[PDB]
Structure 1
Amino acid sequence: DRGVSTFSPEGRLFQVEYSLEAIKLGSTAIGIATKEGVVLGVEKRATSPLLESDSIEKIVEIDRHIGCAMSGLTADARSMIEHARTAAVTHNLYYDEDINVESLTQSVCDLALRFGEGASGEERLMSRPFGVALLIAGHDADDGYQLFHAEPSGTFYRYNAKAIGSGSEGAQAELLNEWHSSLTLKEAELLVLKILKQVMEEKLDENNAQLSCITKQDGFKIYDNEKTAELIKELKEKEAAES
């Protein structure tokens, strides 16, 4: 085509504005940070009936007291393993404590978005800014639970309840009235699975999705297939008792 330095008629890059199309091609995930814990989850779906969901990780862990997720291509998800996970350990290497979620996100965004045509000192060799939507959540030692997100455009915003993926248009619309300040951990476990039911194209299964949580004491803990199936049975019993 032409030089990457070409902007939009509004003065923005093309790869930044077009980075939202690669997110819809990924998996739909909705994070929620309640008063008790922070609800994390994704959607594995299926690429085949012989697909194994045990060895695939769509939800990673940067540090014990925090968590992370991904929606998009899995290539950029490992770029923060050498950056976000390194910066979290670098903080413990210097200040030896839990990094603030508010400061960590902006610190990651410095290591997250770097690109361009070329530069001697900094590495601009990266072409596409992001191919994945990364979620950033955890607990702050001062404020509290904070749910942030790494956007494919590179910016960052404070999200009380965040929805990403292809179904983020219809899920976030109803999410306004669903999220409340009184929403607890147990009440938010059946709420996410109920929203993902209208999202997921197939029957809810332990291998078609993965959920986890962020605890201020035990830390990031994944939900095992035996435990995930329990939340599935609780959803079928809850939906039948609504009417």
Structure 2
Amino acid sequence: DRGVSTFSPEGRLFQVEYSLEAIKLGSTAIGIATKEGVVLGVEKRATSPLLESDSIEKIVEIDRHIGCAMSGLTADARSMIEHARTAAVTHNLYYDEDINVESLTQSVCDLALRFGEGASGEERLMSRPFGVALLIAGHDADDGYQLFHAEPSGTFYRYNAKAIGSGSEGAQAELLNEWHSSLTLKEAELLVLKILKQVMEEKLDENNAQLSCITKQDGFKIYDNEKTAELIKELKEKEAAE
């Protein structure tokens, strides 16, 4: 066939590129950062009415000041989360302080390229790249509220807002215009909830979509249906208002 770490004639790693494709098929996920906190939203996407929608976990906590959303082959993210949590807790044990959001991200990204059938650099044991992207969101005293996009490539970027998944290209286009440096947490919630509605095949309700945020005061929380549903409503009204 061809090595799992072969370069294309264009200078790209085939497996990583293909990895990116599987992610495009993933369920939408959006992250918006405001000086009041960061909001993470995701499309549940139950493949059947019998599937208890709340057993769909695509937004998890890394630490009290760091949470993250995923898109793509979600089973692949379990070990990434484990590593991330372990890194976070560990930094605290060794330094008696919280892990910086960016470092936490950098750590996760370092596992990224650890694949191959025998790459001359260490002992990269993992037969293929991960098939999932992550939106890591949190806050730390050094750089306040932050939002990171981490990919199977090992690279990561910082965004004011970012959408990954099936409707990304379109939703990102919206975010490009919608986002402004003075957004409020409230505004960001509706904005996320709105864009999710536009890209979702399903009629966005409080069962096929989930919200969550991270604030210096209360840390990472995942909005419970009742809370999100009322935000849904609050949105319909404002829209139907003009």
TM over 0.5: yes
Structure 2 portions without partners, runs of 5+: none
Aligned residue pairs, count: 242
Percent identity over the alignment is: 100
Report the Cα offset of residue 55 of structure 1. Answer: 2.0
Q: Distance in 1 between matches of 2:149 and 2:231?
A: 25
Which stretch has the larger CA shift, 231-240 or 110-119?
Answer: 110-119
Deviations 1:113-139 (A, max 9, x none): 311222699442312212111111111
- Unaligned runs of 5+ residues in structure 1 are none
The question of whether the paired residues in 2 share the 8 Å contact of 1:84 and 1:111 is answered with no
Contact 1:98 1:141 in 2 (8 A): no
Report how far residue 160 of structure 1 moved: 1.6
Compute the TM-score of the two structures, normalised by the length of structure 2. 0.94
Using the TM superposition, give the Cα deviation of residue 153 of structure 1 relative to its aligned residue in structure 2, in angstroms.
Answer: 2.0
Distance 2:166 2:230 in 1: 27
**Aligned mates of 1:87, 1:2 — CA distance in 2:** 34
Question: Is contact 2:77–2:130 with CA below 8 Å preserved after alignment?
Answer: no
Report the counterpart of residue 8 of structure 1 in structure 2. 8
Name the structure 1 match of 2:126: 126
1:217, distance to aligned residue in structure 2 (A): 1.3
- Do the aligned partners of 2:41 and 2:193 also contact (CA within 8 Å) in 1? no
List structure 1 runs of 4+ shifted beyond 3 angstroms.
119-123
Aligned residues: CA RMSD: 1.6
CA contact (8 A) 1:130 1:154 kept: no
- Larger CA deviation: 152-161 vs 204-213: 152-161
1:118-165 CA deviation, whole Å, 9 max, x = no partner?
Answer: 269944231221211111111121221111011132211121211100
SS in 2 for 1:77: helix
**Residues 63-90 of structure 1, C-alpha deviation per residue, up to 9 Å, x if partnerless?**
0011111111122211123311111011
Aligned to 2:54: 54
Q: Indicate if the aligned counterparts of 2:38 and 2:214 stay in contact, CA closer than 8 A.
A: yes
Task: Answer whether contact 1:138 1:145 (CA < 8 A) is retained.
Answer: yes
Structure number with higher strand proportion: 2
Superposed CA offset, 1:10-49 (max 9, x none): 2221001111211122110110111111001100122111
